[PDB]
Design a protein around this ligand. Sequence first.
Ligand code: X40
Length: 294
Amino acid sequence: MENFQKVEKIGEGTYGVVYKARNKLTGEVVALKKIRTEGVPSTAIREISLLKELNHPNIVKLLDVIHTENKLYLVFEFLHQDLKKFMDASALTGIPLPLIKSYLFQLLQGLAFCHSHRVLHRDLKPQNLLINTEGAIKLADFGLARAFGVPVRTYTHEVVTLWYRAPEILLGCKYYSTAVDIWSLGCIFAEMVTRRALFPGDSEIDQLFRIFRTLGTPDEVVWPGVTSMPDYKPSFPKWARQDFSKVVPPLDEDGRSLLSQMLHYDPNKRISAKAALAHPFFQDVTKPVPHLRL
Ligand SMILES: Nc1nc(Nc2ccc(S(N)(=O)=O)cc2)sc1C(=O)c1cccnc1
């Protein structure tokens, strides 16, 4: 708008476009997200407005929500880089384990907070995790499907990333639980460690089968009720589970144990964010400073 002077486009999420902008008055630098649309829902505004009262050091602060002319603007505190860029920038040397551990620990604190407040992210991915020069990492772009449905595209027509989608979502479950966020974080954790996406599916079935090929095709023994899921097909190939040491080398056993609990098939067995914070893997967690080139 005119109260804001765009500085540059930051990207085009799954619900809109994000810009870096400065408040002509306050001089405050912010991230301005524009969402598209026959008037904009009212219940959505209420649910978004809710998110404004969510404050935690590991959640990007939502400063203002502005409804105007079918366009919905969200003003967020601005951070300088996202985890996708940082991972790309660290692909040659890898992110130091102590930083990986610090980032995972802070993300679980943010989720434990969201989850205890009945808030689900639903679309965690490297691009939605922001970092600063101080070593903090925060959850951003909370989806908002609980009040908007499942995104089929965008304004410029973009390819939705399925790499971090929990298996119950892929199998058609209609009700997501906090477990879907733990699954995504697990996938992200693995990616920071190996420097390659864990499950880089290029379609929904491919995403599902990449998961099956690595963790084994689920059955009623490991996931009671799985064969009754909406999109479960008795015809799915039955792959055997892969030794977990081949999945995320050279991650230590504490790390592999935690990841295995974040990646359990059964949403009910999957570790909670709170329980994960108590895992032995975090016994020596610290808060290192990342080498950020801005
Ligand atoms: N708050 C906030 N700050 C940002 N800055 C940023 C992000 C990435 C870079 S990047 N490619 O590393 O250069 C630079 C600055 S995005 C963002 C969001 O709220 C947000 C993020 C994702 C989706 N929807 C909203």
